[PDB]
């Protein structure tokens, strides 16, 4: 059993394996990665519409300064299939689906957590600077819980995987 560059054993025993699960490399990859992790089924349009609606309905929280463009303009912009999702989308989708989203940032070798204090359940998405993939355990499990015994080891493996990928030329 030899591990590939996109794989990392979890914990001291290494019985379970964390791996990259690639999604379609289109302009909607953030949404594909989140949909796979949470639903195990693709969704882009519904997720973009959810974000658009939340922004429109909350102009005080998502003001022009926060969005770096007028609220009404952002709400239409995020509906375009070519518009790249980011932290703003992640936060909104996380809140809406009641699952924390942990961004494993390859270039930084850090995990950016969204809503870790609200929801115990979390998914991991891998960010290389211009693209998102999903992270899975044993080629299947995507939803983890931070209070389960193996959670620390899962996060440790995610960080070590990110470090290895940074070192082998995978971040942009």
């Amino acid at each position: 059993r030899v591990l590939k560059s996109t794989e990392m054993s979890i914990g001291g025993s290494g019985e379970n394996v964390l791996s990259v699960h690639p999604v379609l490399d289109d302009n909607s990859c953030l949404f594909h990665a989140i949909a796979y992790g949470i639903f195990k089924q693709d969704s882009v349009r519904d997720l973009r519409e959810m974000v658009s609606k939340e922004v429109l309905n909350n102009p005080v929280k998502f003001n022009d300064a926060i969005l770096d463009k007028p609220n009404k303009d952002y709400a239409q912009w995020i509906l375009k299939m070519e518009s790249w999702g980011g932290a703003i989308e992640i936060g909104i989708i996380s809140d809406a689906l009641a699952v924390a989203i942990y961004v494993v940032d390859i270039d930084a070798v850090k995990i950016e957590k969204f809503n870790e204090d609200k929801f115990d359940n979390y998914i991991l998405i891998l960010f290389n600077g211009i693209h998102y993939d999903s992270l899975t355990m044993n080629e299947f499990k995507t939803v983890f819980n931070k209070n389960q015994p193996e959670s620390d080891d899962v996060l440790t493996a995610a960080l070590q995987l990110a470090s290895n990928l940074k070192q082998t030329g995978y971040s942009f």
């Binding site: 022009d64 950016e112 204090d117 960010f127």
Partner: protein, 75 residues
């Protein structure tokens, strides 16, 4: 002194700063507490985006002032 930094997920981050601190310095402090790289950080105060080269003093940042942190992370 103390300033606060609020995220869009509702969390608040306390910072110890001097009026002499540049926005860059502040992002570096946020990186220390939270591990967020400065290049992914956007800071907003009083409806204005804060620029790397200026100081808190330049924007009238004072006691218990609240900044808003928004991340980029677009892919």
């Amino acid at each position: 002194m103390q300033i606060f930094v609020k995220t869009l997920t509702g969390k608040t981050i306390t910072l110890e700063v001097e009026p002499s601190d540049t926005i860059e310095n502040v992002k570096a402090k946020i990186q220390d507490k939270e591990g967020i790289p400065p290049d992914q950080q956007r800071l907003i105060f009083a409806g204005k985006q804060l620029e790397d080269g200026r100081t808190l003093s330049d924007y009238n940042i004072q006691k218990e002032s609240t900044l808003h942190l928004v991340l980029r992370l677009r892919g």
